[PDB]
Design a protein around this ligand. Structure first.
Ligand SMILES: CCCCC/C=C/C/C=C/C/C=C\C/C=C\CCCC(=O)O[C@H](COC(=O)CCCCCCCCCCCCCCCCC)COP(=O)(O)O[C@@H]1[C@H](O)[C@H](O)[C@@H](OP(=O)(O)O)[C@H](OP(=O)(O)O)[C@H]1O
Ligand SMILES: CCCCCCCCCCCCCCCCCC(=O)OC[C@H](COP(=O)(O)OCCN)OC(=O)CCCCCCCCCCCCCCCCC
Ligand SMILES: CC(C)CCC[C@@H](C)[C@H]1CC[C@H]2[C@@H]3CC=C4C[C@@H](O)CC[C@]4(C)[C@H]3CC[C@]12C
Ligand SMILES: CC(C)CCC[C@@H](C)[C@H]1CC[C@H]2[C@@H]3CC=C4C[C@@H](O)CC[C@]4(C)[C@H]3CC[C@]12C
Ligand SMILES: CC(C)CCC[C@@H](C)[C@H]1CC[C@H]2[C@@H]3CC=C4C[C@@H](O)CC[C@]4(C)[C@H]3CC[C@]12C
Ligand SMILES: CC(C)CCC[C@@H](C)[C@H]1CC[C@H]2[C@@H]3CC=C4C[C@@H](O)CC[C@]4(C)[C@H]3CC[C@]12C
Ligand SMILES: CC(C)CCC[C@@H](C)[C@H]1CC[C@H]2[C@@H]3CC=C4C[C@@H](O)CC[C@]4(C)[C@H]3CC[C@]12C
Ligand SMILES: CCOC(=O)C1=C(COCCN)NC(C)=C(C(=O)OC)[C@@H]1c1ccccc1Cl
Ligand SMILES: *[C@@H]1O[C@H](CO)[C@@H](O)[C@H](O)[C@H]1NC(C)=O
Ligand SMILES: [Ca+2]
Length: 1261
């Protein structure tokens, strides 16, 4: 039977695997044991599949006697399938729920394709460096869960219950936590009473009652999805003073810092893989392919036209054709024609005038005829096949073929695909050829087409992952999202396309918590067995985001690096060609230092001044001080300019200072129409913070760097804008005037949807309510191109995109209402737009920033030998010294010191800290009195033990050596906050019990990997304090502008501008901007800031709803773009600062080995000094790590022979000093040289390396 196992038997089994995957898609999970005929057949087909994968595992089992992971998966799948079938037939715990193993069968499609197995291994092998970040995330989640347990435990269980009973939550359809008259949170007021006893904001799922519930809430907040909801619930529960310190800090630490770490590690790994695969020379094949194609058409056209110069009438037939295409006039004429085609395509809109629809149909045919004629003219003058040779010419040929195909229909339906004339806009991308960077865009496309095979493999593995998780979700939650609620969920797992859409939505991370809550309630509620189903959503989110990162960052980084290398090589070749061609043919106190400062302080004070204004109250005593305080502030800057204007006559920042001061001074007057002009020059007062530039060195540097980066990435921005415009045109064709709906679902026209109709509260037939029928459009529609660009932008931001998707799926016909699930196949448009724009273009932009930062800097060309290990080795050897030990004396201190400095004591206290953390982690809601007393006494016992440790280590280490390790002063401050915590506990303040949790960081700061990673990234963050000052300034400026513009809108609890979210205070405006930067409901806030809102009663006819502004669109879009750009800039700057650690190659010698050697050497020296023992070398050569020193070889051997053979410094037997022997060890480890090269190293170290300050007098020999 070992004969038929290598023939296409293995392809027969592969086809069997594909038909057990197209039978798990056809399956429809019906609610409550329902079925149909297709399922009745699929059972028998699965029986046949089970028979086949059994006698095929038997042959391999009785052929080779289960070791490989894939064959083990085969075996387990087969056995559980047989077990499930047998148990199902016998019973004809849940029986049918054991069929979830059948979704592992598609995982075998990569075991039969090694080409997919290699990319799977490449994706998997990048997980190992991220395990440290995973551990850090776990620790942060645990710490914040315990803090939330200690802060908000069981404080969100009271809602308004009305003053007639406790029937059910008579506070809107979305009840919120409240507080009593003795509380600080939200007050119900009017005919309501804040009565204790209530499930929770999300049916009791979102709260800090338990440690598991707190951990789930913390994870959901860290994923940045629905964290403002939790923050606002906490604000309503306990108050609006100190939950922002919790939630904002959690968001900053666990979402931005962690993302920075992940991006840095992934970029370092990708760079290492690139530098390892470049040695093979894969770039050469791409390099040699471009020049072979450049000379191809350059020689074929030479052959072509030489035939026409002749020796039938081609002399008067061919010269003009090739002299018109290359005339530079045909180029511009074709560009103008394409511009006209774009003009007529983009002029289409809903309810257009009847003349426009005729103009744009006549012009379409005319331009189609013209472009076909031009294509035919070019088709023969440059060879029929040589015309096909070119890249963009293939695009033109395909566009013409498709246009001719779709313009002759004129009888069939759905003419939306006829608008492939929009891809003709890609042909005008030759406008880059006239300008620069055309060799940077076309090189990118060439690299993409060269690597399309790996691109397809990477995109297919992601599709397989999505298919597997969609099948698993269809099995788990299929036909279960059917509860008694009146509204029907749209994101369900009922079908295969619906499951695919739901899994894609969860992968994008938008409203994934809603699907998680739906899945949790489908299995009961917040209970131990029911709520374990959230593991599916957690794993799906984490793994999908990780896979998307590893795919779309690898593609972008590799392709962009290849394109940049191609461009650099091409530039070098052009330089060499044009050089060799030329090498032959030719042959007043304002200039002070303290003043300046004092006035950059005033500038800071002036910036602080206008942030403290009152946005809403026009007249208030606080503004009396501030309004008259700016008067004296403006005088100082007015005096500053006059004192300077005499010195000279002008730069570009004195212009800005003048534009500030003159505007302020004229604004002091104005009078007359003090409504419009004042409201412009009052918001023009946001330029004062910008005066810190040119007055604070470093701010100017970072601003100039950001401007250079903008100028570099403008090409990618332009290409993304072009693609967005094309997709907007396609969407306008698809959904023009189709996204209208009526409040009454029974009317499908505007004329019908008129008058009143009866609604029922919660669908209770006994409670009818009259409401008016209204013909409404979608929030973001596709009526015209401008209305579609913004809808696509909001889709790309992953904000409210499922709502638009499910609104577009129902649309069927212009001017008519929706139909449930009319065109589910239209979701491919949104999927493709998200993949191309929100996933590929964004990662291309980030990789472009990374590459343009990497090719800057390191290209300083430090070509004074000394490659990228030895400079660091030499500087470390120069900057080194023996360390201290402090070995107790008093012969009594030694005993306690030995006790406290052992490893067993350290491990014992680590276990004690773990036990204390576990004790803190089980403070549930509704605990009994015995539990509380036991917890109190256990906390007392732990704090006593830790005081005992502290006393032991003041003695052992003395009161000077204790407060020397910074881990000790932090420990000292922690426990003293626990001793006096018990003092105030028996007779409150919640701040003092948070010190116990903070002690868990000692466990985190014990592994050499996480410690080094965190330390290096923190140092890189500290070393760049202005890249974050840029974000701070942007936030401040936009907060002030929002306060001035939208600061008067009313706080309506049913609108997105309310008590928790508003512009009425600088902290509140900053919090709103932070929430928008996270991207929570920024589109909803923008729509709530549009003009026509009744607003603040405390500001003072014809003004019914006169406030608001149409500036909101630009405000909220520009803020999003600028915030994303600046955050990416900061991330890449930190990554490039820390890039040395991210690409380390730990196998080779590194500074960590030097640190270990120093820590081994430290104990043998009583002081720093530099005096050693001659016999100490015996243990020195044995204690060194073999990669750093020598292995398990005998001491008195060639190791000692070479140690003594080297010319040591002319010292005594043991008076040689530490840096000398360190340099000797580093030079013997690597970069070895023959005798007589000492002077070469001596002269080299004083040229490129830092100054020695004549401190190497004894190190010369
Ligand atoms: C309150 C929070 C405040 C905490 C401040 C506590 C400070 C404790 C004292 C620290 C002393 C400073 C030294 C220190 O410990 O810093 C780091 C680790 O610490 C963290 O990053 C610690 C990272 C902790 C971050 C997790 C925080 C998450 C929870 C926050 C909750 C906040 C709750 C707020 C909610 C409020 C509710 C209202 C270690 O410092 P290190 O210098 O010893 O580590 C080095 C480093 O790795 C070097 O590369 C290398 O030596 P050098 O080059 O000579 O330095 C050695 O490693 P290699 O040779 O392998 O390279 C190590 O020796
Ligand atoms: C990059 C730079 C920006 C990053 C974004 C960080 C987020 C900033 C969050 C700070 C504002 C959060 C909201 C807030 O502080 O709430 C307002 C609160 C008082 O709220 P109030 O409406 O007066 O409620 C009365 C009932 N107590 O106000 C207060 O009482 C606290 C205000 C403190 C302001 C913080 C400044 C630090 C000093
Ligand atoms: C899809 C991959 C990860 C393999 C499948 C693993 C999961 C989906 C499988 C393996 C173990 C299975 C569970 C084993 C036991 C029980 C308890 C029973 O009362 C209901 C079914 C239930 C709850 C099964 C549901 C499906 C299950 C959780
Ligand atoms: C040539 C390309 C790049 C740009 C094309 C711009 C022109 C054709 C487009 C862009 C925005 C369009 C407008 C968008 C919306 C409106 C409002 C309404 O009254 C219908 C027509 C009108 C006024 C459109 C007319 C055509 C329009 C002005
Ligand atoms: C996502 C995959 C790859 C890994 C996670 C496995 C998931 C799907 C498995 C592991 C544990 C499982 C749960 C274990 C126990 C129960 C309780 C039972 O009364 C209903 C099913 C339920 C709630 C299971 C649902 C499926 C489950 C959550
Ligand atoms: C580094 C720089 C940008 C920090 C700037 C901080 C300034 C703008 C912040 C910090 C503290 C803030 C104040 C904190 C509290 C209040 C009380 C509130 O009822 C009105 C606003 C007011 C009076 C704030 C005004 C703005 C303020 C002074
Ligand atoms: C790593 C571990 C030890 C951390 C802490 C987890 C344990 C101790 C936590 C998590 C889940 C918790 C339980 C979950 C639900 C309830 C129901 C409630 O009415 C009484 C407490 C009780 C029974 C909790 C007791 C403590 C508990 C068992
Ligand atoms: C500089 C960041 O701008 C964005 O956040 C973009 C989003 C939203 O960010 C994508 C988050 N996934 N949506 C659209 C479509 C974009 C646009 O209109 O380009 C002009 C920009 C963008 C701009 C330049 C380069 C890339 C991108 Cl993605
Ligand atoms: C704003 O709040 C008031 C207070 O009850 C309410 O009457 C009004 O309807 C709200 N505005 C809107 C648009 O609903
Ligand atoms: Ca969201």
């Amino acid at each position: 039977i070992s004969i038929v196992e290598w023939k296409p038997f293995e392809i027969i089994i592969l086809l069997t695997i594909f038909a057990n995957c197209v039978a798990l898609a056809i399956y429809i999970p019906f609610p409550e044991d329902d079925s149909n005929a297709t399922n009745s057949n699929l059972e028998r087909v699965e029986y046949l599949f089970l028979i086949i994968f059994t006698v095929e595992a038997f042959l391999k089992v009785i052929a080779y006697g289960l070791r490989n992971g894939w064959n083990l998966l085969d075996f387990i799948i087969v056995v559980v399938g047989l077990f499930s079938a047998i148990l199902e037939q016998a019973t004809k715990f849940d029986v049918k729920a054991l069929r979830a193993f059948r979704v592992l069968r598609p995982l075998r499609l990569v075991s039969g394709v090694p080409s997919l197995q290699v990319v799977l291994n490449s994706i998997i092998k990048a997980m190992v460096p991220l395990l440290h970040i995973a551990l850090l995330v776990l620790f942060v989640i645990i710490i914040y869960a315990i803090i939330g347990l200690e802060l908000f435990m069981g404080k969100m269980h009271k809602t308004c219950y009305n003053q007639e009973g406790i029937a059910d939550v008579p506070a809107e359809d979305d009840p919120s936590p409240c507080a009593l008259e003795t509380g600080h949170g939200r007050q119900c007021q009017n005919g309501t009473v804040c009565k204790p006893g209530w499930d929770g904001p999300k049916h009791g799922i979102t709260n800090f009652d338990n440690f598991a519930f707190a951990m789930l809430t913390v994870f959901q907040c860290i994923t940045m999805e629905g964290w403002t909801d939790v923050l606002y619930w906490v604000n309503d529960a306990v108050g609006r003073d100190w939950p922002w310190i919790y939630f904002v800090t959690l968001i900053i630490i666990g979402s931005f810092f962690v993302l920075n770490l992940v991006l840095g590690v992934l970029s370092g790994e990708f760079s290492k893989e690139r530098e390892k695969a470049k040695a093979r020379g894969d770039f050469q094949k791409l390099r040699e392919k471009q020049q072979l194609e450049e000379d191809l058409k350059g020689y074929l056209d030479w052959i072509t036209q030489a035939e026409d110069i002749d020796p039938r009438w081609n002399r008067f037939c061919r010269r003009k054709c090739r002299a018109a295409v290359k005339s530079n006039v045909f180029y511009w004429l074709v560009i103008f024609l394409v511009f006209l085609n774009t003009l007529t395509i983009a002029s289409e809109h809903y309810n257009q005038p009847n003349w426009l629809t005729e103009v744009q149909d006549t012009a379409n045919k005319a331009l189609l005829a013209l472009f076909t004629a031009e294509m035919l003219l070019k088709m023969y003058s440059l060879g029929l096949q040589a015309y096909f040779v070119s890249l963009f010419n293939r695009f033109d040929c395909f566009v013409v073929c498709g246009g001719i195909l779709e313009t002759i229909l004129v009888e069939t339906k759905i003419m939306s695909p006829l608008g492939i004339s929009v891809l003709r806009c890609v042909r005008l991308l030759r406008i880059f050829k006239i300008t620069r960077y055309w060799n940077s865009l076309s090189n990118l496309v060439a690299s993409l087409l060269n690597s399309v095979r790996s691109i397809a493999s990477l995109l297919l593995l992601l599709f397989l992952f999505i298919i597997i998780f969609s099948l698993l979700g269809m099995q788990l939650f299929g036909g279960k999202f059917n509860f008694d609620e009146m509204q029907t969920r749209r994101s369900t797992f009922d079908n295969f396309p619906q499951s695919l859409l739901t899994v894609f939505q969860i992968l994008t991370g938008e409203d994934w918590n809603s699907v998680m809550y739906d899945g949790i309630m489908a299995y009961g509620g917040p209970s131990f067995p029911g709520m374990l189903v959230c593991i599916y959503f957690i794993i799906l989110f984490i793994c999908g985001n990780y896979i998307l990162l590893n795919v779309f960052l690898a593609i972008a980084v590799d392709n962009l690096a290849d394109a940049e290398s191609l461009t650099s090589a091409q530039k070098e070749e052009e330089e060499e060609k044009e050089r060799k061609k030329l090498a032959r043919t030719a042959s007043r106190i304002v200039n002070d230092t303290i003043f300046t400062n004092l006035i950059l302080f005033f500038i800071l004070l002036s910036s602080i001044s206008l942030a403290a204004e009152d946005p809403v109250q026009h007249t208030s005593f606080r503004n009396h001080i501030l309004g008259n305080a700016d008067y004296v502030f403006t005088s100082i800057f007015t005096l500053e300019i006059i004192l300077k204007m005499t010195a000279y006559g002008r730069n570009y920042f004195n212009i800005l200072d003048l534009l500030v001061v003159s505007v302020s001074l004229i604004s002091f007057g104005i009078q007359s129409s003090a409504i419009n002009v004042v409201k412009i020059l009052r918001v023009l007062r946001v330029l004062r913070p910008l005066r810190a530039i040119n007055r604070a060195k470093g701010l100017k540097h970072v601003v100039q760097c950001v401007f250079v980066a903008i100028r570099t990435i403008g090409n990618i921005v332009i290409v993304t804008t072009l693609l967005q415009f094309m997709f907007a045109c396609i969407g306008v064709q698809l959904f023009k005037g189709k996204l209208y709906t009526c409040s009454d679902s029974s009317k499908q026209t505007e004329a019908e949807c008129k008058g009143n109709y009866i609604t029922y509260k919660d669908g209770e037939v006994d409670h009818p309510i009259i409401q008016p029928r209204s013909w409404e459009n979608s929030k973001f529609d596709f009526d015209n191109v401008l209305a579609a660009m913004m809808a696509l932008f909001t889709v790309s931001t992953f904000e409210g995109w499922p709502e638009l998707l499910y609104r577009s799926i129902d649309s069927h016909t212009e001017d008519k209402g929706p139909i449930y699930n009319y065109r589910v196949e239209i979701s491919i448009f949104f999927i493709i737009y998200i993949i191309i724009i929100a996933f590929f273009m964004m990662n291309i932009f980030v990789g472009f920033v990374i590459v343009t930062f990497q090719e800057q800097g390191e290209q300083e060309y430090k070509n004074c030998e000394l490659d990228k290990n030895q400079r660091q080795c030499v500087e470390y050897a120069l900057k080194a010294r023996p360390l201290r030990r402090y070995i107790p004396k008093n012969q009594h201190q030694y005993k306690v010191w030995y006790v406290v400095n052992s490893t067993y004591f350290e491990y014992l206290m680590f276990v004690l800290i773990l036990l204390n953390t576990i004790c803190l982690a089980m403070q549930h809601y509704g605990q009994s009195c015995l539990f509380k007393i036991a917890m109190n006494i256990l906390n007392m016992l732990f704090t006593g033990l830790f005081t005992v440790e502290m006393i032991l280590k003041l003695i052992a280490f003395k009161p000077k050596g204790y407060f020397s390790d910074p881990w000790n002063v932090f420990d000292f401050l922690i426990v003293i906050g626990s001793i006096i915590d018990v003092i105030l506990s028996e007779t409150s303040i919640t701040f003092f019990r948070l010190f116990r949790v903070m002690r868990l960081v000692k466990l985190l700061s014990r592994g050499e990997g996480i410690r080094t990673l965190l330390w290096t990234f923190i140092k890189s963050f500290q070393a760049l304090p202005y890249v974050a000052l840029l974000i701070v300034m942007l936030f401040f400026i936009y907060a002030v502008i929002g306060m001035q513009v939208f600061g008067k809108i009313a706080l309506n609890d049913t609108t997105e501008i309310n008590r928790n979210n508003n512009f009425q205070t600088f902290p509140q405006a900053v919090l709103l901007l932070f929430r928008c930067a996270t991207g929570e409901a920024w589109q909803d806030i923008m729509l709530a800031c549009m003009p026509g809102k009744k607003c603040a009663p405390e500001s003072e006819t014809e003004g019914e709803t006169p406030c608001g502004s149409s500036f909101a669109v630009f405000y909220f879009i520009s803020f999003y773009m600028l915030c994303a750009f600046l955050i990416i800039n900061l991330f890449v700057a930190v990554i490039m600062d820390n890039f040395d650690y991210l690409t380390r190659d730990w196998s080779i010698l590194g500074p960590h080995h030097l640190d270990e050697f120093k820590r081994i050497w430290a104990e043998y020296d009583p002081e720093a000094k530099g005096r050693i023992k001659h016999l100490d070398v015996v243990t020195l050569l044995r204690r060194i790590q073999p990669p750093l020193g020598f292995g398990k070889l005998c001491p008195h051997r060639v190791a000692c022979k070479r140690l003594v053979s080297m010319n040591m410094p002319l010292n005594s037997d043991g008076t040689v000093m530490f840096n000398a022997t360190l340099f000797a060890l580093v030079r013997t480890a690597l970069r070895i040289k023959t005798e007589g090269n000492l002077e070469q190293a001596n002269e080299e170290l004083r040229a490129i390396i830092k100054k020695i300050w004549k401190r190497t007098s004894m190190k010369l020999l």
